[PDB]
Point group: T
Chain length 166, copies 12
Amino acid sequence: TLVENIYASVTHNSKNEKTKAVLNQAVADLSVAASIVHQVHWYMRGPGFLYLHPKMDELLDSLNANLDEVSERLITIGGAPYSTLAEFSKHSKLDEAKGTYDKTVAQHLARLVEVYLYLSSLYQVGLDITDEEGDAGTNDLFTAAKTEAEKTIWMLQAERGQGPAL
Amino acid sequence: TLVENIYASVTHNSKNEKTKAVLNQAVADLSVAASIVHQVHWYMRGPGFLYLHPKMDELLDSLNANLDEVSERLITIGGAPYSTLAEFSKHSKLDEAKGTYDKTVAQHLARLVEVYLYLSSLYQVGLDITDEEGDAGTNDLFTAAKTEAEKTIWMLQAERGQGPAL
Amino acid sequence: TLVENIYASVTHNSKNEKTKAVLNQAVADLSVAASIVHQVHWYMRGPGFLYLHPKMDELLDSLNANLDEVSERLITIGGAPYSTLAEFSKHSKLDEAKGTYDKTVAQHLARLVEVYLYLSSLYQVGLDITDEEGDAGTNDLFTAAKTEAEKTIWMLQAERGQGPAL
Amino acid sequence: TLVENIYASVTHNSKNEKTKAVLNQAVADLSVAASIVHQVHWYMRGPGFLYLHPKMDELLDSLNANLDEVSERLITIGGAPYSTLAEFSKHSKLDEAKGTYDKTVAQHLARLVEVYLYLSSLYQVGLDITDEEGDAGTNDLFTAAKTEAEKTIWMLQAERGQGPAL
Amino acid sequence: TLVENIYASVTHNSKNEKTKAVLNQAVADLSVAASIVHQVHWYMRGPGFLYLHPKMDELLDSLNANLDEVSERLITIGGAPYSTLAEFSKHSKLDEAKGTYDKTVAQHLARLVEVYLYLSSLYQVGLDITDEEGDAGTNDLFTAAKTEAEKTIWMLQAERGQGPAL
Amino acid sequence: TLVENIYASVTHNSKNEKTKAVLNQAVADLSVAASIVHQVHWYMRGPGFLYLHPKMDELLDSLNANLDEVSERLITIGGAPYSTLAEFSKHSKLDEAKGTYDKTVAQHLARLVEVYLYLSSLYQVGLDITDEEGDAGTNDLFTAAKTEAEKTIWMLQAERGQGPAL
Amino acid sequence: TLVENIYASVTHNSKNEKTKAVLNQAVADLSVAASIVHQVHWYMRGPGFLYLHPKMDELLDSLNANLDEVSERLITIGGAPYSTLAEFSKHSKLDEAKGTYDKTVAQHLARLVEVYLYLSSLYQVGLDITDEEGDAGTNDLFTAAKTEAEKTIWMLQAERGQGPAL
Amino acid sequence: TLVENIYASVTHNSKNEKTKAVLNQAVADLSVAASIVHQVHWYMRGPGFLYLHPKMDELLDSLNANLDEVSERLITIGGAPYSTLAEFSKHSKLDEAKGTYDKTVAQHLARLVEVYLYLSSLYQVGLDITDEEGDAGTNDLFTAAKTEAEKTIWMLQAERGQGPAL
Amino acid sequence: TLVENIYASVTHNSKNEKTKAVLNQAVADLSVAASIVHQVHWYMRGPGFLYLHPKMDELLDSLNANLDEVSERLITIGGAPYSTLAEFSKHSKLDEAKGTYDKTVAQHLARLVEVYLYLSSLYQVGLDITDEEGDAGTNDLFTAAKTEAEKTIWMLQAERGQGPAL
Amino acid sequence: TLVENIYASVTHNSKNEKTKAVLNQAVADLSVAASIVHQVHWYMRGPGFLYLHPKMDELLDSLNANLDEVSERLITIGGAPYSTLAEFSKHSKLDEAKGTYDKTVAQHLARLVEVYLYLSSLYQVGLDITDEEGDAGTNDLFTAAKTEAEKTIWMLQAERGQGPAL
Amino acid sequence: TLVENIYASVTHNSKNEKTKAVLNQAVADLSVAASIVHQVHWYMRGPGFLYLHPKMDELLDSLNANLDEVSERLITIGGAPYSTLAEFSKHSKLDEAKGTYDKTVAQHLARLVEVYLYLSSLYQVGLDITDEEGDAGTNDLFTAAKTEAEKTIWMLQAERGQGPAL
Amino acid sequence: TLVENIYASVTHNSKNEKTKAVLNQAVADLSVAASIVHQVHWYMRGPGFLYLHPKMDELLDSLNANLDEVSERLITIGGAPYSTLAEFSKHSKLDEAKGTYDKTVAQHLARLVEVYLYLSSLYQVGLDITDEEGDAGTNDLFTAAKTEAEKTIWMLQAERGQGPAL
Ligand SMILES: [Cl-]
Ligand SMILES: [Cl-]
Ligand SMILES: [Cl-]
Ligand SMILES: [Cl-]
Ligand SMILES: [Cl-]
Ligand SMILES: [Cl-]
Ligand SMILES: [Cl-]
Ligand SMILES: [Cl-]
Ligand SMILES: [Cl-]
Ligand SMILES: [Cl-]
Ligand SMILES: [Cl-]
Ligand SMILES: [Cl-]
Ligand SMILES: [Zn+2]
Ligand SMILES: [Zn+2]
Ligand SMILES: [Zn+2]
Ligand SMILES: [Zn+2]
Ligand SMILES: [Zn+2]
Ligand SMILES: [Zn+2]
Ligand SMILES: [Zn+2]
Ligand SMILES: [Zn+2]
Ligand SMILES: [Zn+2]
Ligand SMILES: [Zn+2]
Ligand SMILES: [Zn+2]
Ligand SMILES: [Zn+2]
Ligand SMILES: [Zn+2]
Ligand SMILES: [Zn+2]
Ligand SMILES: [Zn+2]
Ligand SMILES: [Zn+2]
Ligand SMILES: [Zn+2]
Ligand SMILES: [Zn+2]
Ligand SMILES: [Zn+2]
Ligand SMILES: [Zn+2]
Ligand SMILES: [Zn+2]
Ligand SMILES: [Zn+2]
Ligand SMILES: [Zn+2]
Ligand SMILES: [Zn+2]
Ligand SMILES: [Zn+2]
Ligand SMILES: [Zn+2]
Ligand SMILES: [Zn+2]
Ligand SMILES: [Zn+2]
Ligand SMILES: [Zn+2]
Ligand SMILES: [Zn+2]
Ligand SMILES: [Zn+2]
Ligand SMILES: [Zn+2]
Ligand SMILES: [Zn+2]
Ligand SMILES: [Zn+2]
Ligand SMILES: [Zn+2]
Ligand SMILES: [Zn+2]
């Protein structure tokens, strides 16, 4: 599963080391996810743009709220968040591609769903790790982020005419 | 001057090509500037943290508003904004360093001042280019961004006990 | 007509008996209409979900405001509103079907239009009855509810690419 | 205990089947609870009506917020919520009776307390099931709903001159 | 009936003379009703004071909104509203008594119910008269005031443990 | 009377044809009335300008709210509103004159009063027609618009030192 | 002086008897003042109506706030406020006259100034009495009411082209 | 009197020494009063709880606003406020008892009235002392606090069915 | 180009004559543009209506804000704005057609894009003229209006699946 | 012209020296203008006072916002604003006279118009100077201030019954 | 003392002459104090600028609210406030110095404390004078201004690491 | 560890006895913590006071929100919260000292950090106990309080120039 792979990857490289590592992974991934969402906001063309475009700023605002919270939680528990674009891009497991206006609305929606599926799996790894290390506060952070990610998947999937398939 | 160098660099690589290039340069630089500001928000330690920390989120909100406006202006006039972290980091003329908690408040303030001085010079290049190409709307965008950057320099300089020296 | 049939049905089973009966019919029908609208809110899949889904909560809020007003009006004039789910379901003239994700957006819109057409006809019966019995206050309630129902039909019909055909 | 009986009943009829079943049970029960609360709102007579009546709309608003959240959570995790009045009434473990103006304020308060005691027990079953199946997000939903139900029991009990006895 | 008596009295002493007379009667009666409500606000003693006291200011605000609207409507249609305390007190059909702290909460509630019953009957006379004279705008004013008066009767009656008996 | 003439004119050129015609007449007249009000807003000179000028924007906002409501009501009941400036100007019974700064404040006030007197008479025709055709919803629309027009006449007349003379 | 006469009159008919008497005098006078202000609100005709009319509702709101505060203060200190229109009209030292549309704006302004001059003198008597009886709380109430009355005199006088002459 | 005893006690142990002592006495007493009010908020059982419980938080918010103001005033005039729970409890003249759920609503109301009667007497001592020492600013603070305390006594007494008896 | 033609047309028929002429041209064109937008608001049918319909009121509000600003600017600089529907319709370079429900959503979007392209070209003429005549304030007005028009073109084009092509 | 004289005067006594001088001139003049406006606010007597008086506080608020912006802009670009009353009064080109209550409303309006005409001419000098020295940000500041000054002239002139004559 | 000297000075040059003189002294001093505060706002450099700078605008807003209130009180009681910068500067007992960026934060804080100490002493003189002349309303104005000045001294002193020493 | 000691102490003296004991311990400790925070609010002197002082009221508001929630949770689950100052002071594990103005800002910050470290350890004990006893609702309460305490430690530590060291 992606969850096993994320776990393996996060814990490859102190009592809360794995929690710090998974939080930092989320710093990088939230930063890349925000960049991807912004790309949709800007490059989208097609019917529905007029409600999808502002929807991207709502998703963006939430991703950025997640980022600040995750990173401040990481600092709070004695870690050191990635804090440069090169660190985000190297450590994130999300890929980016050059923006192009010729992607269809359907392609943007599928990409967003993949981003949120990835984030929900990362957060599940965050749940497992924080349970193992006994960090209830960070577990609650990951629980809320996963729950919101899953709801977002359901809604984007619905917009695509599909079930949540999460 | 930095202004001459930015101009040379922007126009090194259609009736509004240079305006599009300078806007895109601003996309990259605003993105890196936001990242730098976030790093201060997170890594700062020292007396004054309790008002400087939320001040960074205000600066961040403004930089991100600038970014969206600049990028949508670029799209509007027929360009294609950078829209990945790797593009921001490669094309930006701002450098980033790994976050460290041992930077002093004075070092963070000096870094912010350098970022805003850089942005104000970039915007001056934007003014020259948009005047040359007759893009009044983009000229107004750069005028407001420069004016706000300059005010920010004055205030950060004041916090450092210095004059604006812009 | 549906109006004749609703009238016949309402008045089949005191100076304001028919007004009380038509108000109570509206209690049952508003309750079922709200349930139907909620089903669309939940089960819808397809392009447009992202504005249609919150639109259902707006329609729902209005139906529930109608319900409380109608029921309190009924109480106020000396009646006794239905106040259990089994009473709503037995006395309502609206049918419900088990939710299914495979209904198309077009089917949900057609169903909503039928619900509002039904409600507007019920309210017309409410107008006739309250005029006959001289209840100006309840007549005004039905007038506003009918007017809002008719506007809703026009807008939902427009979303379907059709005229109001009311 | 009621908790054992609810569990037995929910799980009588895939990795998250029991979580889906308990969420759907909550759909039905929240719907019936809202109906019961509305009946108090409408039929109550006696000293205190003027603050108890609007209190019922507050309880109602919260029950309806719970309903939408529970049902959207159910959809999100791959289930299918009850979405007709006949399904709510058949599957709910709460009974309803015909409204009557001759119930005393004390009887309405006792009924509300029983409804919330039932809901808190249902949510405890939701906690057990979501812990067993590893659904942290749904566990958090049930935790918050139980906590709010318990607080509501304490306050309604206090209004009756009694301790929470939960 | 009180309605017949109010009508007789109003029309005892131009195309809209009776509408003007009934509006002016409402000026006087709303003014006295407000005074009565204020007396309850001030003189009430007993359990429930803490929600009944502010409830009187809500009733008062509505009565005063009614007064201004009625009086401006009267002016608008070519009449001349009573506009002194002696005119209100002489022409009103409501009686006042000296305030006393020894009235019970039950007595205040009964008095308020009588005031609103009187006002609803006056408004019914306003409905009959405005229908007869073809003043739709003033008819709508009386319809809304009657509907609000009737709702108020239902709620005050409920607080007394009684049905609306309107 | 003007009312007879408006009626004759509206019904000169289906169960609700006259209601549709009178609504469409209101579309044209509201559009011209708004234009006239705007002309006062712009061209007025004289003492009182500083409260009369913003008063024109309030009158304008209300006229435009009326216009949208009337036109959407017309659409809702199966008609087709005028929707070009040439249609408004040809079908409106209100005349316009070229703006001039030499009109006195008194002349602007007299003109506004004539506009509102005209609109109130048109709305009376709307009342008669909607009563005849049994359109309660449109009757309520015209009732509220007439009532507001009449109040506006009273206030503008008062500003002129005159009675409503409606 | 009017102050001597008010004092004589108030104290003509326990440790705080005079404070209670002066507060009750204010109950009656505030009630009559509000009635007078309302009469101006309704009957005024002439240039300036459009800002003077809403100004009367502001003055009215303040007078009614004064009334409630004065009367609740009276209750609080062990008195019994006038609470019927006949008591207000008999005990007030302000006279009322039948409303007439032929009063000029200048006459309304002069009347308001006389009302406020009277109230400020009454409040001065309230200051003297509360100082004599050692009621600091009621003294503060009268101080604020006098200060506001005096400011109102200055502004109304200014509108008349006159100095405060208080 | 209690006032004489408070004075004696306050001034038992510089130009404003007595003002500082009475302010500090208020620090201690406001702190204990807040604790007592909180105890009612938590331990109350009986009809009326649902409006009395939030009423305690309003009383609490005001007591805490008083506390901060009194203590900052004390600091401002050169004193040193009590600032530990042991100082509040030792120096306050209010007694506390262990919370118990078996106190009746009537007992809680009587206790609150005693607390406010005590506070109003303390504030009267504050008035006498600040007058004697010429501290107008602190006199105004005590005047407003006494006036609010007295109003609170009137309202709580009314809820008990009694007059203010202050 | 359209820009050359608008210029030629505006300046065909004092130090700021051309600025006044171009502002007045904008008065006429903004008025016709608003009418066209309203026609879309009313006549549109098809999927997307539910977000496109309110989008038209946003566009309308902005066009009307532009109109008032342009016209007040014209007055301010010594001109005389068109202020009748016949002047708007004769002098505007925008054509209108009778509303019809059979236009597709795509046709409405194309028409809006043409309107905004026209307005942006008119504003460019306004920029050239105000630069030539040295009217910086009016130049700023046209700059902001052009920038907003261009952004609107980009967004409407995106909704059509197209690039801005401005 | 006044513009030539202001220019001569400003530049009588570094790359942005003239921009700094004109900004500082505006510091002094805005300060004196605010003082003049305050004098009207206080000393005015005559019909219209009740809307003109609060209008002066609006003008005052804007002048003070201008002052802070101008002065902070001056600081930002490396200057040193006047910051004492004696500097404002010596360097301002506006004269003040002792307040007197015998100035007519017409005299106050004429004085305000002269103040704003002066300020608009000063801002024109600011435009010329900032264009010459290439300070786009300060040019934008002067453009907005001039545009607002000109609008204010138009409105005050209108209140006087005159055209803008700017 | 400064209080004796202010008194002597104020009363050196009718029943309320001294109250008018002390109010006018406050007009001049508040105006100079505002100017001084503005100078700190602009010229400050040093750590803490970022919270001290906006703190100056808060102090400024309060000083300007004081100024308007004092001056309107003076007008209200029959005086004539200073209303030119030259009058403020001549009659104020506060001195100003040319702004300079080389003042330290500590120097600005000490200066502000001296300004507020001066104002509190002036207000004490206002208290003595208004007590002597029996002007309770103006006494209350000075009491509130003194109390606020004293609190401000305490807080600024605290920022300096000092006690209030008032 | 402190956690072991708190646990030992809490459980030294029914299915949820330990949860009730730890909640009650939090009642006492939150009450003492609030008192300590208030002492800093009042007694602090030194640079930074102007942002640290209001920061204490924010911390205080949160501590008091925690207190009410904890205590109501305790009541809700069948316990009895401490509710007198003597109980808080005896049972709290936090010590208080007499306020003194000579504590440095650094000492206040260190004390606050110790308070929050203590509270976070107490909440960890609350987590362990609620997990052991199966109280998910109280576990969530302690999780949120711990998370907020930890964030507060990070920020206060940062203000001291230190890492969170939690
Ligand atoms: Cl890296
Ligand atoms: Cl690249
Ligand atoms: Cl049934
Ligand atoms: Cl079923
Ligand atoms: Cl009479
Ligand atoms: Cl036509
Ligand atoms: Cl009497
Ligand atoms: Cl002690
Ligand atoms: Cl023409
Ligand atoms: Cl000088
Ligand atoms: Cl002088
Ligand atoms: Cl104890
Ligand atoms: Zn956008
Ligand atoms: Zn955006
Ligand atoms: Zn790395
Ligand atoms: Zn933060
Ligand atoms: Zn942040
Ligand atoms: Zn690249
Ligand atoms: Zn939803
Ligand atoms: Zn929903
Ligand atoms: Zn049945
Ligand atoms: Zn209700
Ligand atoms: Zn309700
Ligand atoms: Zn079933
Ligand atoms: Zn009250
Ligand atoms: Zn009240
Ligand atoms: Zn009479
Ligand atoms: Zn305007
Ligand atoms: Zn306007
Ligand atoms: Zn036609
Ligand atoms: Zn009115
Ligand atoms: Zn009114
Ligand atoms: Zn009497
Ligand atoms: Zn509570
Ligand atoms: Zn509470
Ligand atoms: Zn002690
Ligand atoms: Zn619409
Ligand atoms: Zn619309
Ligand atoms: Zn023409
Ligand atoms: Zn004023
Ligand atoms: Zn003012
Ligand atoms: Zn100088
Ligand atoms: Zn600033
Ligand atoms: Zn500022
Ligand atoms: Zn002088
Ligand atoms: Zn404070
Ligand atoms: Zn505080
Ligand atoms: Zn104990």
